[PDB]
Amino acid sequence: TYEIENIRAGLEAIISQKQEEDCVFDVVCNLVDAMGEACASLTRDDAEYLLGRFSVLADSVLETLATIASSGIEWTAEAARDFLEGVWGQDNFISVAEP
C-alpha cells in the first residue's frame, strides 16, 4: 500500500467510531501527526481524497488548518490540541419526533 492509503484508512477509523462529540479536532490532530508542516498547504482535492466516504468534512478541516497556520505554533499534535481545545475557552436543541 501507498502512504496516502494508510492515512485514509486511519481517518475513516476516527470518524466512524465517535459519538456525542464533533470529530473535526481528532481528524486535524491525526493529519498534523502524519504530515506536520505539509498540512499548511494541503489542497481541497487532497483533503477530499484522504476523508474517503466522509469528504463533505473537507471545508471544516481546511479552515481549522488555516487557523493553526495563521497563529504560529510548531506543527505537532500536542501544540495543535493546546491551541484548538484552548481557543473555545452555545447551541439550543429541539427534539423532533418520527411519524
Binding site: 502512504e3 496516502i4 498547504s41 471544516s60 436543541f93 429541539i94 423532533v96
Partner: protein
C-alpha cells in the same frame, strides 16, 4: 460527391522557411519534442503557426510523368507532424535533462533493434534548396509531407524546385515555401545529387515514426519495414504478403501444442494491419475547427509573449494524465507483447480463443524465426541495479516505451514532471534535498555526470519510482488501454442508448432542462438566486421534484398511446462512446501521433483474429511456415477481411471512388522550372489510383442493466432494503446541506456531518438564536422523510453534487420503477477529469533547471520562494456533460466476438469497456474491483481549442 474528388492538383510536399527575427520560437517549443543538443525535432501541423491560414490538408499529388505530355495524380492527406531540420538549434528543448541520445543508443542495441543507417552521399547544401536571395543563416527550415509519399522523403527520392517559391504569411511572419516532387516526375532523370536529402531528418523519422510502428508489429528490422511500406505505396502491393519473413516468436509460442496454427494466425493478423492501416491514414479527412491556432479560446485573456507561453503550459498540464496512464498502466498499448491461444484447459469460447497479450518480461526474452531457428538471444536486464531494485521496472523500460527516441523520450519526461510522487508505506527513502545534493550529484551518473542533479532523468525516475507497473511474463486475456479524440455522438446518460431513435430519451432530457431553466437553474446546475434560509431550501427541492414528476407523467402517457414495449428496451440498453479515426482530430502533441497510430494497428490485429482462425481451420498449415502458406492464401484473406471486419459492430468505414473532372490542368512547366524558368502549361492528367477507404469511428459499448439470470454474479449487484444509520449522510441532500450550512445555521461551531449524524441517532436539531422552532422542525422532517424514500427506492449508486444531477437521478429512478427493474443496482461510468494546482516547489526539483546543488541546506533555500504546477484527477458524477464538451479520452477495451442470432452463422464484434491494471495509474482507482462502476479519463476541448 466526396472530399477526394473535390481536392486540387499539387506537389508531394513543401519545405517552409520561417524568419528568425520574428518567428515565435518559445511558443512552438511548448508543442515540440526538442532535447538538449538536438539536430532535428517534430512539431504539429497548425494553421497560423506552422502553416498559413487556409492550408489544404487534402490534395491530388502529381507523382509520375510516363512521358513529358502526361501526368498521374494520387489522392492523399498530409502527414500530421512537421519535421524541423535546418537551424533547429534555435528552437528551445521541451526537457532540460542531458545525455539522452547515448542512453537511447545503448538501450536500442540490448533489445536488438536496428539503428538508422545513412546514405553514402552528403546532405543537400542550403544553396541547392533555398530560394535565390534568402540568407540561409536568417531562417528556420522545416518539411510538411503527404501521408502517401513520406517514405520517399526518408529514402532521399524527392526533388526540391526553388524557382517555384511562394510568399506566405504564417501568423505575423513573412515566410516562403518551396514545393517537393517525386523523382518519377522527370522521365529523363535528374543527376543523383540534385535529389533532396538530409541525414538528420531521416534519422529523426527512423526513431520517432517508424520504430513505434515496428514495435506494434513485434518486428526489429525497422529499415526493412520502411522499404516494404515504400513499395506498397508506389507499386500497389496491398494484396501481396510482405511482413511475414520479418516476424519473431517467443518459446511460449514455439512450444505451444497448437504452435503451427498460432504462428500462421499472428503472421496473418500483422499482414492485414500493414495492408489496411496506411490506406485509412492516407484517406481524405474532414478539417476540424481545432486546427486553427489563431482562433483557440485558451489565449483570450493573454497580453504579450510571456502570458501566451504560460497559457500553453497550463494546456499541456491538462493533457498529462492521458500520457502518464499510458506509462503507469500494466496493460498500456505500449506494452503489447504478441498473440496467444486459450490452451483447451481454459475459459474462452471458440471465437475468443486467440487473443492479444501484454508483458515487459516477455518483451525481453529470446526469439525464434518463422523456420524455428534461433534469432534474437534476449536480454538479462540491467547490468547494474538501479534505484527500483532487481526484477522491477527500470529506466530502460521507459526508454523502450519511448521507442528509443531522444525526441519522444524528452516529451514523455516533460509530462511526467507534472505528476505527484506516491511513496510506498513501508520503505525508508531519502528526503528530496538529500537525494539531489547526494546520490544525484555523484560523478558516476552516466547521464549528467552529477552536473545537472535537479533535472536529470535519473532524479525524475527516483521521484516517481513506486508508480511504475510490474515486469510481467504471463499469457492472460486482459483489456488494453487506448488514447485519442472522441466522436460526435456519445450516449453516456444513466440509461445510455435507450430510445435514441423513433418522443426520444434525448428529447426527454432536453424537456427536463427547459423546466429547470424556468425555476432559475442552468445546465451546469448554477442558481440565479441562492436560498435565504430554511423555507427557501425546502421550496427549491419541492419545486424541482414537482417538475420531474410532471415530465414522467407525460413520457409514460406517450409510451401508452404509441404502443412502445419499453420494458424490453430497458433490459437491452448500452452506454456508447465513439473513438474517432481522423488523425487531424487528435490533440496538438507529437506523442498523440504515436498513441493514435499504435491504437489503430492494435485494434485491426484484434478484429482479424477469428477471421484468420476460421480460414486456417478450413485451409490448414500442414507444417508449412507462415511465409509459404501466405504465398498461396493471402489474396483471399484480404477480400474476407474487407467484408467481415467492417460494419460488423466495432469499426465503420466507407469506400469511395475518386474522379478528376478536367482532362487537363494548369501547372508550371517542370522541365522549365528545373532549369530556373516559371511559366504555365496545360498538362493532360489521369488518376493512378481510383479507390479510397475513408475510416469513420471505433465504437466502445457498456451494458447498463443486470437481469439476475447469471446467478454467480448477483452479490455484486443486489439492492438491500433495510433501514441503515447512514441514510441522511449517504442520502441525496448531504452535499446541499453542507453547501448551505452557514446560511442555515449562522453561528454554530458544529460541522454539517456531525449536526445531521446527531439528528439521525438522537432526533435533535439546534435552533438558531433569532429564528423560530416550527421552521427548523419542518426542515428536519423534510430531510428525514425524503432520505428514507430514497433509501427504499434508489437503484443509482450516486450522491448528487448539483441540482441537475439530483433531478436526472430522480427521473431515471422513476423509469426503472415503471419497468420493474428495482432488485439490482445499474452499471455506472464515471469520468476522471484533470485539475491543475500550484504547490510549493520543495518536492519538485525540476524547477531549479541545470543548476548545481552544493548541499541539502542550499536546496531548501533555493526552493523556499518557488512553486510548481502539478495535476490530479477529480471524479465526476455526470459523464454526459463532459461528453458534450468533445473530450480527449483514455479507456481500457477488450474486443469480444460472437455468432449472430436465429441461425446467422456470421462473426460479429463488440468493443467492451474494461479495467485499468497497475496500482500507480490513479489514487481514485485504489481499493473484481467493481463489476458495477467503470472509469474513463476525459479532458474537454470546447472553450480550450474550439470556440463555443
Amino acid at each position: 460527391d466526396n472530399l477526394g474528388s473535390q481536392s486540387q492538383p499539387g506537389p508531394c510536399g513543401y519545405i517552409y522557411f520561417y524568419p528568425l527575427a520574428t518567428y515565435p520560437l518559445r511558443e512552438v517549443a511548448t508543442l515540440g519534442t526538442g532535447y538538449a543538443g538536438h539536430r532535428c525535432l517534430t512539431v504539429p501541423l497548425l494553421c497560423g503557426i506552422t502553416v498559413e491560414p487556409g492550408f489544404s490538408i487534402n490534395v491530388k499529388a502529381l507523382h509520375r510523368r510516363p512521358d513529358p505530355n502526361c501526368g498521374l495524380l494520387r489522392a492523399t492527406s498530409y502527414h500530421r507532424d512537421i519535421y524541423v531540420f535546418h537551424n533547429a538549434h534555435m528552437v528551445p528543448p521541451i526537457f532540460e535533462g542531458p545525455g539522452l541520445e547515448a542512453l537511447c543508443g545503448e538501450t536500442r542495441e540490448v533489445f536488438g533493434y536496428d539503428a538508422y543507417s545513412a546514405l553514402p552521399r552528403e546532405s543537400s547544401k542550403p544553396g541547392d534548396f533555398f530560394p535565390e536571395g534568402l540568407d540561409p543563416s536568417a531562417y528556420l527550415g522545416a518539411v510538411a509531407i503527404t501521408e502517401a509519399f513520406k517514405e520517399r522523403l526518408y529514402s532521399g527520392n524527392l526533388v526540391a524546385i526553388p524557382s517555384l517559391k511562394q510568399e506566405v504569411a504564417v501568423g505575423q511572419s513573412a515566410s516562403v515555401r518551396v514545393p517537393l516532387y517525386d523523382k518519377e516526375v522527370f522521365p529523363e532523370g535528374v543527376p543523383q545529387l540534385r535529389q533532396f536529402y538530409n541525414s538528420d531528418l531521416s534519422r529523426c523519422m527512423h526513431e520517432a515514426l517508424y520504430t513505434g510502428l515496428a514495435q506494434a508489429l513485434r518486428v526489429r528490422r525497422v529499415g526493412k519495414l520502411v522499404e516494404l511500406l515504400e513499395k506498397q505505396s508506389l507499386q500497389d502491393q496491398a494484396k501481396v504478403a510482405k511482413v511475414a519473413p520479418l516476424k519473431e516468436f517467443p518459446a511460449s509460442t514455439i512450444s505451444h501444442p497448437d504452435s503451427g496454427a498460432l504462428m500462421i494466425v499472428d503472421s496473418a493478423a500483422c499482414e492485414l494491419a500493414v495492408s489496411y492501416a496506411p490506406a485509412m491514414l492516407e484517406a481524405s479527412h474532414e478539417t476540424p475547427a481545432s486546427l486553427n491556432y489563431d482562433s483557440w479560446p485558451l489565449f483570450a485573456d493573454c497580453e504579450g509573449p510571456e502570458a501566451r507561453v504560460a497559457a500553453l503550459h497550463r494546456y499541456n498540464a491538462s493533457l498529462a494524465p492521458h500520457v502518464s496512464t499510458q506509462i503507469f498502466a500494466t496493460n498500456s498499448v505500449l506494452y503489447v507483447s504478441g498473440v496467444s491461444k486459450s490452451t483447451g484447459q481454459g475459459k474462452e469460447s471458440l471465437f475468443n480463443s486467440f487473443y492479444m497479450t501484454h508483458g515487459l518480461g516477455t518483451l525481453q526474452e529470446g526469439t525464434w524465426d518463422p523456420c524455428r531457428r534461433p534469432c534474437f538471444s534476449g536480454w538479462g536486464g540491467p547490468d547494474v541495479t538501479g534505484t527500483n531494485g532487481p526484477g522491477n521496472y527500470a529506466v530502460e523500460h521507459l526508454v523502450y516505451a519511448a521507442s528509443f527516441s531522444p525526441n519522444l523520450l524528452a516529451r514523455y519526461a516533460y509530462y511526467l514532471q507534472f505528476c505527484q510522487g506516491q511513496k510506498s508505506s513501508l520503505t525508508p527513502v531519502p528526503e528530496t534535498g538529500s537525494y539531489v545534493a547526494g546520490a544525484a550529484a555523484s560523478p558516476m551518473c552516466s547521464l549528467c555526470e552529477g552536473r545537472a542533479p535537479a533535472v536529470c532523468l535519473n532524479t525524475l525516475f527516483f521521484r516517481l519510482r513506486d508508480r511504475f507497473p510490474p515486469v510481467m511474463s504471463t499469457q492472460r486475456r486482459d483489456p488494453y488501454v487506448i488514447s485519442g479524440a472522441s466522436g460526435s455522438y456519445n450516449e453516456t446518460d444513466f440509461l445510455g442508448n435507450f430510445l435514441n431513435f423513433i418522443y426520444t430519451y434525448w428529447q426527454l432530457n432536453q424537456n427536463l432542462l427547459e423546466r429547470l431553466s424556468r425555476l432559475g437553474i442552468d445546465a451546469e446546475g448554477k442558481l440565479e438566486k441562492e436560498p435565504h434560509g430554511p423555507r427557501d431550501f425546502v421550496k427549491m427541492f419541492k419545486d424541482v421534484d414537482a417538475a420531474v414528476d410532471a415530465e414522467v407523467v407525460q413520457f409514460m402517457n406517450s409510451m401508452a398511446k404509441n404502443n412502445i414495449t419499453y420494458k424490453d428496451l430497458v433490459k437491452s440498453c448500452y452506454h456508447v462512446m465513439q473513438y474517432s479515426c481522423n488523425p487531424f482530430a487528435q490533440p496538438a502533441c507529437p506523442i498523440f501521433t504515436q498513441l493514435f497510430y499504435r491504437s489503430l494497428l492494435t485494434i485491426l490485429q484484434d478484429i482479424s483474429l477469428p477471421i484468420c482462425m476460421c480460414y486456417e481451420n478450413d485451409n490448414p498449415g500442414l507444417g508449412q511456415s507462415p511465409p509459404e502458406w501466405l504465398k498461396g492464401h493471402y489474396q483471399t484473406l484480404c477480400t474476407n477481411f474487407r467484408s467481415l471486419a467492417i460494419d460488423k459492430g466495432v469499426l465503420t468505414a466507407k469506400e469511395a471512388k475518386v474522379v478528376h473532372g478536367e482532362p487537363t490542368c494548369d501547372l508550371p512547366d517542370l522541365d522549365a522550372a528545373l532549369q530556373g524558368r516559371v511559366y504555365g502549361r496545360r498538362l493532360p492528367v489521369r488518376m493512378s489510383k481510383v479507390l479510397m477507404l475513408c475510416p469513420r469511428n471505433i465504437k466502445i459499448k457498456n451494458r447498463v442493466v443486470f437481469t439476475g439470470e447469471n446467478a454467480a454474479l448477483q452479490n455484486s449487484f443486489i439492492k438491500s432494503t433495510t433501514r441503515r444509520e447512514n441514510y441522511i449522510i449517504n442520502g441525496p441532500y448531504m452535499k446541499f446541506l453542507n453547501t448551505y450550512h452557514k446560511t442555515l445555521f449562522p453561528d454554530t461551531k458544529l460541522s454539517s456531518l456531525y449536526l445531521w449524524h446527531n439528528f439521525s441517532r438522537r432526533r435533535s436539531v439546534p435552533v438558531p438564536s433569532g429564528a423560530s422552532a416550527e421552521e427548523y422542525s419542518d426542515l428536519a422532517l423534510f430531510v428525514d422523510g425524503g432520505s428514507r424514500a430514497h433509501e427504499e427506492s434508489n437503484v443509482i449508486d450516486v450522491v448528487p453534487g448539483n441540482l441537475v444531477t439530483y433531478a436526472k437521478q430522480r427521473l431515471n429512478n422513476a423509469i426503472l420503477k415503471a419497468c420493474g427493474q428495482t432488485q439490482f443496482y445499474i452499471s455506472l461510468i464515471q469520468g476522471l477529469v484533470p485539475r491543475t494546482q500550484s504547490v510549493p516547489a520543495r518536492d519538485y526539483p525540476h524547477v531549479l533547471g541545470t543548476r548545481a546543488v552544493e548541499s541539502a541546506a542550499a536546496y531548501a533555500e533555493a526552493t523556499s520562494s518557488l512553486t510548481a504546477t502539478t495535476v490530479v484527477c477529480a471524479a465526476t458524477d455526470c459523464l454526459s456533460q463532459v461528453c458534450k464538451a468533445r473530450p480527449v479520452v483514455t479507456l481500457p477495451v477488450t474486443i469480444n466476438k460472437y455468432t449472430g442470432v436465429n441461425g446467422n452463422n456470421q462473426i460479429f464484434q463488440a468493443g467492451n469497456l474494461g479495467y485499468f491494471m497497475g496500482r500507480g495509474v490513479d489514487r481514485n482507482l485504489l481499493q473484481g474491483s467493481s463489476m458495477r462502476k467503470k472509469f474513463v479519463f476525459a479532458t474537454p476541448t470546447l472553450g480550450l481549442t474550439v470556440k463555443r
